[PDB]
From a paper:
Variable temperature solution light scattering and/or SAXS experiments have provided important findings about influence of temperature on protein shape or association levels which expand our understanding. Previously, we provided a detailed structural and mechanistic insight of thermophilic l-asparaginase from Pyrococcus furiosus in its full-length (PfA), and a conjoined functional version (cPfA) (domain architecture shown in Supplementary Fig. S1). SAXS and crystal diffraction data analysis brought forth that despite lacking a 19-residue long linker which connects the two domains, namely the N- and C-halves (N-PfA and C-PfA, respectively), cPfA adopts a solution shape and crystalline state that is comparable to wild type full-length protein PfA with improved specific-activity. In conclusion, the findings reported here provide structural evidence in support of temperature induced higher order oligomer formation conferring stability to thermophilic proteins thereby regulating their functioning.
To further investigate if the terminal β-strand of the N-terminal domain is important in providing stability through oligomerization under high temperature conditions, we truncated cPfA beyond D178 and named it as defunct cPfA (dcPfA). Our crystallization attempts of dcPfA were unsuccessful. Diffraction data was collected up to 2.61 Å resolution. wo additional electron densities were observed in both fo − fc and 2fo − fc maps. One of the electron densities was present at the same site where residues were truncated from cPfA (named e’ density 1) while the second was present near the residues 42–45 (named e′ density 2). The results showed residue E173 of dcPfA was interacting with V2 of peptide (corresponding protein residue is V180) through two H-bonds. Thus, as all the interactions between P1 and dcPfA were identical to those present in cPfA, the peptide successfully restored the structural features of parent protein. Later on, successful crystallization of dcPfA with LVVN peptide where latter retains its location at the speculated site (where the terminal β-strand was originally present in the parent protein) re-established the structural stability and thus also restored functionality. At the highest effective peptide concentration i.e. 500 µM, the specific activity increased by 1.66-fold, 1.85-fold and 2.36-fold at 37 °C, 45 °C and 60 °C, respectively, as compared to dcPfA alone. Such peptide-mediated activity restoration depicted that the peptide probably binds the same sites where these residues were intact originally in cPfA (supported from dcPfA-peptide bound crystal structure data, Fig. 4B), thereby reconciling interactions between native functional assemblies.
Numbering used by the authors:
A (entry chain A), E (entry chain A): 1 to 175
B (entry chain E), F (entry chain C), G (entry chain C), H (entry chain E): 1 to 4
C (entry chain B), D (entry chain B): 200 to 326
The structure:
């Protein structure tokens, strides 16, 4: 029912400017541009707006605190993030927040939502479908697949199917 | 701070 | 806090691990070959680790994508266990690193850290 | 001769690279994220590399299994290029390391080493 | 026609003794135990007998020199090796010996040839089939697949299918 | 969306 | 043994 | 040294 989306940045929320400088969108704008319409009664917090290569440990603290503040209020949380360090973030968060009462789903995209063939809509559709599932825990949603956050790794640098559940069954996938 |  | 991740390659000298410890790294992750182990033929690696593995935790993961580490499978592995190396089981590289950093935030006792790293906290490990 | 391979993780301090160079490592491989780049927000990494990348070759590979590195794709990447980092293209981690060691056996000139690392010798690279 | 097999050790040539100490077989014995019968007019050199974790750069020099000495005499060379650093060896050799006139094929196994369900016969059958192919270059043969040596990585630590050609097409496979 |  |  |  009530779903909070937290922005962290990443390609998902990008629109490279007319010279060579990446610029960032708010998470709310990202959803509108992706074209997610079912998502009503959805709140939006913007926490960072960086390329995830820039992610430092302190960011995990900010993010966990934010999350801890919001678990009792929301039924599912989604966090948009750069793919580069997504699995680091997802894993670390999994240790800080040992027993989440709600699904906390990380996602992102390789092609920015603004672009024509972006993987953003699918990833977000996926993330939202699962955020409503009632499945407690920290997850990653990518390329129509949901993975335990603490078993996910980036395996491809230039493909939509960038992630894999390693040594552990995929939790769910649209197949 | 949240947008609805 | 600070953890250093080094990929095991041939001819790798244990002197860098010494420097790491000096610098104040509080944990070290060695990304090794296959099921796991430390070279002892023609390197001071295994010796150096024997020393440092009691000051800071020294964790062994694998370079290979799947199946993870098992130091009991081979002798180079079993030696590393004896040397005080903490295995990473079937954890992802990212779950291993972050688990380590997390545990470090809570303790500095290498034996505790070893018990913790071997315990399945959230689904990261098959123990 | 001696090459050091370090996995890029968050909070990684460029001080270890300094120590490596001191120790006499003649090449450094950084296994970074995705298509490539060096952190500059809240770390001295990019700065430190700007310094060392002219003394020893500093090579960027990726942690990800497939598709390999492209420093031109993102700004963190493009910065690393400017910083003097040598990209590893689509090479395996093992072809990268061994190619580096091999080239090192033949020269110590970072610009030569850079031209060489970017040249497809035997099928290791798509250049 | 004339094929040289060089032993480097590895699980392939193992038979763990009755207490916990790995012992090693000669490459020639390994073939007999695997059960390779077609291989006649095949020579056998034993160069090392170590677990490949122990492999150091100096070993690549010994091996390349040996190889350089034997390319003009043989039509194909096969090198049995531990899987742990096989791809390092295969890659480094590829740089030292830039233009081999013959196929030089690396192989090994995860299950020792002495064991009942060993992958050794297949790997060796594969290695030998390809050593006769007339395809110049350095290769790796594993799990019925032949890969460019300089594009091969160990991807699994506890499976027969331990290797993959990365970012590059498989050269050949029994399929 | 499908689990198994 | 098959190439492509 | 080689075995035949
Ligand atoms: N460089 C981007 C990669 C992506 O989002 O696909 C990031 O991780 O922030
Ligand atoms: N530990 C063995 C692994 C194998 O041969 O399968 C080696 O590489 O020597
Ligand atoms: Cl893409
Ligand atoms: Cl430090
Ligand atoms: Cl050294
Ligand atoms: Cl096996």
């Amino acid at each position: 029912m009530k779903i909070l989306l937290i922005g962290m940045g990443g390609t998902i929320a990008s629109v490279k400017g007319e010279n060579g400088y990446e610029a960032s969108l708010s998470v709310k704008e990202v959803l509108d541009i992706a074209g997610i319409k079912d998502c009503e009664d959805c709140d939006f917090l913007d926490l960072k707006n960086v390329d995830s290569t820039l992610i430092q440990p302190e960011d995990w603290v900010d993010l966990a605190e934010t999350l801890y503040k919001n678990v009792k209020k929301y039924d599912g949380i989604i966090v948009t993030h750069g793919t580069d360090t997504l699995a680091y973030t997802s894993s670390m968060i999994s240790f800080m927040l040992r027993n989440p009462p709600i699904p906390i789903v990380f996602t992102g995209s390789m092609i920015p939502a603004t672009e024509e063939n972006s993987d953003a809509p699918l990833n977000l559709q996926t993330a939202i479908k699962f955020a409503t599932s009632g499945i407690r825990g920290v997850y990653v949603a990518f390329n129509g697949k949901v993975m335990l956050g603490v078993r996910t790794s980036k395996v491809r640098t230039m493909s939509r199917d960038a992630f894999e559940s390693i040594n552990y069954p995929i939790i769910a996938e649209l197949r | 701070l949240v947008v609805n | 806090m600070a953890v250093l991740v080094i990929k095991l390659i041939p001819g790798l000298s244990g002197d860098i691990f010494r420097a790491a410890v000096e610098l104040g790294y509080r944990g070290i992750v060695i990304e090794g070959y296959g099921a796991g182990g430390i070279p002892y033929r023609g390197s001071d690696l295994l010796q150096t680790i024997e020393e440092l593995s009691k000051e800071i935790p020294i964790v062994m993961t694998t370079q290979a994508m799947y199946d993870g580490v098992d130091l009991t499978r081979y002798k180079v592995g079993r030696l590393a266990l004896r040397a005080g190396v903490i295995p990473a089981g079937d954890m992802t590289k990212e779950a291993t690193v972050t688990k380590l950093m997390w545990i470090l935030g809570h303790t500095n006792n290498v034996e505790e850290i070893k018990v913790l790293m071997r315990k399945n906290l959230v689904g990261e490990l098959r123990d």
